[PDB]
Amino acid sequence: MENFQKVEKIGEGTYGVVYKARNKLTGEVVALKKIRTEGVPSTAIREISLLKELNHPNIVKLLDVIHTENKLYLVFEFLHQDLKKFMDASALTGIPLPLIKSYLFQLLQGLAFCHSHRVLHRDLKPQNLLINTEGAIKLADFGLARAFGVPVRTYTHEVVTLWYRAPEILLGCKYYSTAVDIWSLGCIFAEMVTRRALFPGDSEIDQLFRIFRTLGTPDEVVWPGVTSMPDYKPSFPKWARQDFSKVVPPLDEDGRSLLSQMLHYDPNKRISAKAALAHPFFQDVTKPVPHLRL
């Protein structure tokens, strides 16, 4: 690195290798993402550069976009743990409801902010939600999907997780809306509560059918226009909807109500981040300190 001192490899992200690094001049510790083929689209750099201005307490700050030696590096503020690791670590006892509520509330504030600035995430998952010792949680990688492209494989043949994909994406809709992020966050909310992924599909069709088996196969009544979707097939099995009381026990009715609104099939009926923040579930929200072992 021209000015960076690699501390350690954080992993192989969706867009490339990520390292925890220290700025030799500022002393600042950051996450450095090396972006993967041969050229680096100027449209991408302009788009990414715009995200440097998207600053909010619940959004991982994009510090710099470095385009040198015809290579692209993304410098992000560093956080010590991600929600996937935290959930695994909390698997035995479960994350306390007050902390689940604090995290959901903060994530919705982050989404409300991004969506108000016309920025979508499109690939929210526990691994992209970062936490610190102060009880904060932040969304990482907002806007990169649009600035770049389809995931599929990180850069070293790595199975793309479909568990948090909204149904309209799975049915081949070409235009994503802010609703896709609310769907993903609803899936994450459920997983924090039950300690098990809500829809752990291992293929696009298994993902879609797992959603259908739980929420019922969508029809024109609950989702106008669904039968005209690109990948909709009249041959899809018709499953009956299950009761939320069975899906996310023992979450209370306020929680079930909010989750149900975050998981509506019709993206237009799905609750917005702004509206969700006003839901009765957050009446008693607080900001607890998590037990973080680093």
Ligand SMILES: NC(=O)c1cc([N+](=O)[O-])c(NCCCN2CCOCC2)cc1NCc1cccnc1
């Ligand atoms: N900005 C960051 O600080 C950060 C960036 C990425 N990233 O991919 O760009 C990341 N992702 C790697 C996620 C690795 N996880 C570990 C356990 O859950 C499954 C995969 C984790 C991060 N911070 C938390 C973080 C996590 C681990 C070490 N250091 C910082």
